[PDB]
RNA sequence: GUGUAGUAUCUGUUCUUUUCAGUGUAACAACUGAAAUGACCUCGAGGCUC
RNA sequence: UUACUAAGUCUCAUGUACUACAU
């Protein structure tokens, strides 16, 4: 319960500081590495696939270095399926191509500088497009095709006035588009064949700083803060009924009708509903640290419930699991109420025996409230934290019985089993 | 119609890891019938907590401790003239004195007394994220970013009990680095440096303050302008060889200083240089300072932005006359750590804030004060040593990472 | 006096304005407009409910007459307390019956109206006409 | 106090004394009034309590207090709690 | 009586908590709390603040903690045009 | 300087007149006190405090403003030092504890004043003073003089002018202000016990028996301070102490036996049981004392030996028990008040080392005894032996001979002894599962006693038969219930109340006991009996009868016809918010059970019938009966009724629903949450209704429904309720304003700022000098509860403002 | 089924020195100060009028 | 085919509730 992990791995220290990780998309896992120089600006790129790395052409060195090269942001595309480019963004403000190589039985990565194309602004978030660059500007979102000697704006969508810039973006199954802010919060966008452009469809609900954003599903999207907050959001329904029943040729210019309300609150309140819908907050959380990856997987270690599983940046692996029916969570739920005031009733009942005849903190140790720390920047939602229900394990048994007789509900046995059923079952 | 309201159940599978407070005392006696050494630490990460102990000059993980929801601003341990327990401040305010005990078949963290301080929060008047203990343990100072400073009296008992709050309350002046000095149980005093929020100019100012075990309050005593340029303080323990007058190390980014707190000495030395000087190179500063004393040999470690690790001791300059001096040398250095410990035993504990904590033991300890080459000394204040770094690693040695 | 006379006009503040037609005259002697106008414009801001600078203590309403009383949301209505007891100018009822209605029937029942994000009312509306709107707009197909 | 409103608190930072309050005034959450599940113990600043005074009762000043008085749940969570060193100094 | 009582804790509250805008206060003053306590967050969380760290790319940690402590006075703009 | 005498006129404003006003003389005279005279600035601050006039807050008030002007005047209280001597010297004398204690601040803020050397010089030539009150004044001051101004710093000058010879005054009165500082000092004797020892045993072998006896005072308030640990400076004095425990004569023997009785306790393991073995030859010999004061003494001496490790159990019954037993257990002591206590805590605190069954068959005949006086002080200790070591040393024998002792002493209480009454139900309670067997002895006991008809008798009677009745009417016996329901019944008419209290609590106990119809008393003739009963104004009486009818309706529900219940509900409901609280507790605990076993329907009419009856002077308490009734299966059950109570157009019956809906919503923490949806269509029409008044109180349900349900995921509900809420910000009045308030904070935790937020901050400046002094309160109060989460919701961007914060748009 | 003091709320009614300047107000309102007298022209409006 | 807004202040009367206070 304590690690859940195993590490693998004179005084030590590198000159380079890593930057980003890498994977290719058509190779199920090969990562490659990308870091930099704490210096005159330099990089280096570490592949590996398999068990450990590899050799760089018949060099001995296992890593590349560039030099003059540093990287603001990177990311990996593969324009043909049977070709593999690297994509780095300088400094300098230049769009840096290269192209990857694996020896095969020779094993090893060869890169190989292509093209050369300077960028107005320091594209802090790029990803895969459909064959395309997807890039986002300073201001707007560029999605560049391959050209030769240099690649091409193939297309570029100019930003609703509030977004000043782009953190991170994510797309989904290269139809929809979910673009964070670093003052302003995420918003949606549709891309349109034959518009050529995306095309926002829904505003978020408040102010949040998004520093990594992604996809569980085609309405729904999570996204962290840089002040920690751990949120998830969903389009509402007469939202979803509208773009499931019409095209999205028709939202820019063309007939879409929209109910009464919307168009009242278009004229009456511009700036806030300027994209017609709002994010109804689905679920919202507190992790205090930062988060740096969220990953989907449709299933942790073969079990059936699709969990999400983020990293921070000060470093932690948490995940969020969907309760399949409902009993579930409404055990969980009050598990989690009888951990949360726990001290209190401690300090309740160690006070009526003061009165027939132990700090108020006890049980918590720390005179914060559960609700009141998770709630914190904004209120927990839908989410119950079964961080504090593990505490629950720790526990005497005099203290466990003592706390599970508020329920008219199952025993402490049965309480421990469905605690424990997390880890097990749901990963 | 079915409510889609996804219900998340969020696990913390593996817990922080920047560990940011620390704390020397001994807690726990275990697999001992009657054992007390000095010799153990326990580390806090915001929410999770850990307890490590050495005894064996490599460290072990004792029990990793329940979450406690809740973000630790400061954690320091207190001695009492007995099992020493550590004195623990977060947010809601409380001043959390907390002892680790043995209950059942496991090692669970009970606490004393919580004190409400503030409100539930991470604020600039919460009396947290600066905080020291006297280092014969009478009393915990909790001091605040920049508002006020709180300083309770603790005393032990049957019952442990901690009396009413000392307050001092400067509006515009905003607080960083509180450094405690330690004291022969004279009066407790601690030293801040006070940069002033409403100002035309940027002026950071370090004062003084006695707290009056008799008079029962904390008493501002030398206000002293410094440069704007200032970073921290150190406590110097006594000097009571050389010539209550507790002395002080400021360092600033380009050169260190220490200070009397009549003002008398004011000791000027300029801290060596790189050779290679990399590309961007700041001024630099001074991250960590701290003290050691053994057979009348007492040093400083004061490691900078680098990582570079020095020493200071202290010189009577018996030609003049016997007056301090400031003797500034070259260490193994280390990466960037946050905040530096040594055990009774010889082994210095490393936090960095970096990546990873790790533990010495020091053989070499360093070059002796009467070597002119590569020592600096307050004889002359304005001076540089330049310096190339050592890898070979001589003076301290790697025992435990984690 | 001069400060009062030193105010630059409202058009000239729209200018400074990424949302020019939430500005308004009144704008003109903000102490500090040109952040006014920043944070009034801003992007998810609601601006001010507008009954202010009218002295009638934001309800006149000559509506408010004509204001039904109350009427029980449905599922209520179905535990028949209404003909049990007559409010308009003893019942026994079964716990398992109430505690189904609010639980069993009730958990997926939420009100049909609510309000958005900026929504605001203001003395003049009546959200049941747009209720029965809502509804007609579901209901009624060409 | 919530209540009747010429009654003036202290608001200092408490100390670890609680605050008495009477049987008569028992089962009040000093600020809001409230008889309902009460949470954390008051405690109030040394200079409320010193001699005679400190036996008086927190909310009506007047009576010795036997009983200790709680903050209630939604004045702990609304922070009310952790404000200052409840007290009516002022008769009223 | 009641008003009154409320200027009284607006006193209080504002002696303790500082910046509380109170009916007239000046762009300078009010935006100063902010940049106050916006500042004072950076740099309070130790998760924020090893954020901030590495996205500036200082040297070290403390360096941007005090940095951001000497960014709440007004005249480290100049001090730092100074250098 | 006359204008200084008109100060004192400032100090009664100080004393007459506001807070502030007379705090403002204090902060006017800190800073006017070094330009005031020191002479008549005493001559003038000394008699104002000296009259009997001084009252305990003007004590107070004077004591704080001589400690101001000794903290301005420093220097210039020196010549002044022979004024206050005279003046705190008797003050720190005093009988209340507040006195002593504002003399020895006084003192210690005079001598903290000057320096060290001006209190020596004053306290030295104050040893003259030949009577002894003087002389013990003395000490006592330069004792306190001492504590503050360093124990050390005093303690080379104190030595050097008391190890002299001139007389026995000086030589007594170095004694006395060691004890005295050591008494006022506390547990701050630990690094200065040596010190003082050093000085101090210069008395242990003193020629003089006063200067013997005043070493020896010393000695023990030393030890007695710093113990229990830290005996190391104890040996130096330690082979004295043990040797002339049976070397010195009358009162030296005494004091000699009085600090061993401190040492004892704080001495090591090893040399205890030497020191009490060479102790023992002096003590156990003269354990019949001629007087008082060696008796006290050798009693504490005996406890706090029997309170150390040293000497065991053992040795205790072998050389310990039979002394204590023949020259202290007897009834030798039975006017003795003092004695009578000293010789009961002793025993109580040596029956836990030398077992209770060895008392226990050896007490047996103090209590039996004729004599009452020393009959009270045996069934004492005995009670308190019981309830120190419990039942387990309980001999068969022992317990008989037990028991016929307590008959006995319970039989012969020809005076009200209550240590009798509360030692019955110890013994009771000690006897468990063998009260069974010896059922008849005390059914008669309480026959004998229950029928003789007498008040004190009778109350006394009741009283031991509630506290031992779950333990004998329980014993499944079936047989008893009859014969102890028949008398219960019989007199329930008694003029007293105290008597119809016990009554009331004895059939509670029986009907707790007892089962339906399992109970002698019938309960259609119990449920009529005690229904005029309630009716009564008595507080115990009714605080009894409350919980005798609760109780009735416990096991059997029923018992009773439905209209009955309906008037005894609508009785009580007047009850529900009494004086006491326990009536307020108990009307709660007994309706519960009354609805449960009426039903929901006719409760619930009830008392929505009862809501337009009782004008507001007593109406809400019916709301909470609503709210009582809504608590054994939650508020789903009393909700919708209260709904169609709203639908009436009745405005007070609309306000009585929505107080009785905060009410009930702040009485439910978790329960609510499930609720809140069928809540927010009647605030549709409350927070929209016209008048202030349902504004007002529907704010009040938001406050707490908004509270208690935050975090739920009904933000979208909460967000609802506040968009009707924001309009009513710039209301006027208090309650409205504050009520507004309240309820927008309690929205501030269930949607977070952010939301909140962007209302205040579209409104947060505005030119309107009114909306601004509106919303910067609801800011105000935001930025009390929020900080930290109102941080990254500032709406500021370089545009917005000049500075802004370069390293928010850092990313990596 | 009364009297003393006092309050709130409808409705009816009506438009207070023509102007200037200041305070005040979101702008009003309101408040604070003074005062033109005479001549002429076109359809209450208007005057680089004297 | 009419693209949705009127009462305010003063004065002297009428309409209706109410609050302390006394038989």
Known sequence: LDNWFHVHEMLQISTFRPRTILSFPNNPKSILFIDNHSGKKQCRISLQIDGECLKFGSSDHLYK????????????????????????????????????????????????????????????????????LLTAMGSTIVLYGLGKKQLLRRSVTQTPVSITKIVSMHQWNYERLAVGDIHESVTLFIWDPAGNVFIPYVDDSVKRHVTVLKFLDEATVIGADRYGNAWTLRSPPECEKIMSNHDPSELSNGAIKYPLDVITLQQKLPNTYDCKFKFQLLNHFFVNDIITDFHILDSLSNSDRPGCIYMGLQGTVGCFIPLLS?????????????????????????????????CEGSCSILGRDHQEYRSYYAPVRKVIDGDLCENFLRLSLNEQEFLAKNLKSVQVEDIIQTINEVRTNYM | AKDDELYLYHLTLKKQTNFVHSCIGHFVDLEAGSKREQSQLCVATETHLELYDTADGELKLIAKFQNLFATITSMKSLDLPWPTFLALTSDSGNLSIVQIIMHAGALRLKTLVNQPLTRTTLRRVSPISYMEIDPNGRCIILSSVEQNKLCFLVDYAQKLRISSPLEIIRPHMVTLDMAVVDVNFNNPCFVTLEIDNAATQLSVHLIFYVLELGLNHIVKKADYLVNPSANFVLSLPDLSRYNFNPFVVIGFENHILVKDMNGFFSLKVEIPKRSITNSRHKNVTIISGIVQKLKNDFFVLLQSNHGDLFKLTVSPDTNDRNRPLVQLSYFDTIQNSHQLHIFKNGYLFALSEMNNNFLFQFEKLGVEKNDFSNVLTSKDPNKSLVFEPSIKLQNLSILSQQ | KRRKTEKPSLSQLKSQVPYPQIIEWYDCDARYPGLLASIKCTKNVIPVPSHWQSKKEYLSGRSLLGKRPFELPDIIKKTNIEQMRSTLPALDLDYKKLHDVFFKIGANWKPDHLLCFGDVYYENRNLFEETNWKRMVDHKRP | SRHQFDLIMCLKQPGVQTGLLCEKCDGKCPICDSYVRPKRKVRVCENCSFGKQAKNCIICNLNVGVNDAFYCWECCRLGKDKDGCPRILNLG | AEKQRQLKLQKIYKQKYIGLGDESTTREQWQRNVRNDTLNTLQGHSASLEYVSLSRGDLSIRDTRIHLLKSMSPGYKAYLREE | EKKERTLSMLLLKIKNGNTASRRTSMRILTDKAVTFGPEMIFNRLLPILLDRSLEDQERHLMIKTIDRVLYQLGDLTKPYVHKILVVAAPLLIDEDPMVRSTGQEIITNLSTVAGLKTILTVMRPDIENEDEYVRNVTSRAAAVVAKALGVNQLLPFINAACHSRKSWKARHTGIKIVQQIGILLGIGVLNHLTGLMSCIKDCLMDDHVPVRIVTAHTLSTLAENSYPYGIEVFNVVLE???????????????????????????????????????????????????????????????????????????????????????????????????????????????????????????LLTPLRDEAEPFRTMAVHAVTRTVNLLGTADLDERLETRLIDALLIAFQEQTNSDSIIFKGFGAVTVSLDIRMKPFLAPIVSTILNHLKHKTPLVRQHAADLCAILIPVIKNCHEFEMLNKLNIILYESLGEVYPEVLGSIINAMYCITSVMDLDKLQPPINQILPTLTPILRNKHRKVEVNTIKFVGLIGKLAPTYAPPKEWMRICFELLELLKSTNKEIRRSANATFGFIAEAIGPHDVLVALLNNLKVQERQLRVCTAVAIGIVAKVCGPYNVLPVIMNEYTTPETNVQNGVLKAMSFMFEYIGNMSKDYIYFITPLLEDAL????????????????????????????????????????????????????????????????????????????????????????????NNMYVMYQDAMVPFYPVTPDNNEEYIEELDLVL
């Open chain 1, 326 to 358: 409902k009993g579930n969570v409404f055990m969980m739920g009050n598990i989690e109420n009888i951990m949360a005031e726990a001290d209190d009733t401690f300090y309740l009942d160690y006070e009526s025996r003061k009165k027939n005849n132990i």
């Open chain 6, 240 to 362: 004295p102490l043990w040797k002339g425990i049976r070397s010195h004569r009358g009162k030296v023997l005494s004091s000699f036996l009085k600090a061993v009785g401190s040492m004892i306790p704080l001495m090591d393991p090893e040399y205890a049981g030497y020191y009490t073995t060479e102790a023992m030859r002096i003590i156990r010999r003269e354990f019949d004392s001629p007087d008082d004061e060696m008796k006290k003494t050798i009693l504490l001496v005996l406890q706090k030996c029997s309170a150390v490790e040293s000497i065991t159990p053992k040795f205790l019954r072998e050389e310990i028990a039979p002394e204590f037993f023949q020259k202290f257990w007897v009834r030798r002591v039975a006017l003795d008040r003092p004695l009578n206590k000293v010789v009961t805590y002793t025993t109580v605190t040596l029956a836990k080392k030398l077992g209770c069954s060895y008392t226990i068959d050896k």
């Open chain 1, 65 to 132: 270095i560039l030099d003059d090269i540093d990287c603001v942001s990177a990311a990996i595309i593969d324009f043909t399926r049977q070709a593999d480019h690297l994509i780095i963004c300088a400094g300098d403000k230049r769009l840096l191509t290269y192209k990857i190589l694996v020896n095969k039985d020779k094993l090893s990565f060869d890169i190989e500088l292509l093209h050369q194309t300077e960028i107005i602004s320091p594209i802090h978030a790029m990803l895969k497009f459909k064959n395309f």
């Open chain 6, 688 to 779: 929209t209704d016209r008048d202030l008044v349902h504004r007002q109180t529907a704010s009040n349900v938001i406050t707490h429904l908004a509270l208690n349900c935050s975090g739920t995921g009904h933000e979208d509900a909460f967000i609802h309720l506040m968009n009707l809420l924001i309009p009513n910000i710039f209301e006027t009045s208090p309650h409205a304003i504050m009520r507004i308030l309240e309820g927008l904070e309690a929205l501030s935790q269930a949607l977070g700022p952010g939301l909140f937020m962007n209302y205040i901050w579209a409104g947060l400046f505005h030119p309107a000098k009114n909306v601004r002094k509106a919303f910067w309160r609801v800011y």
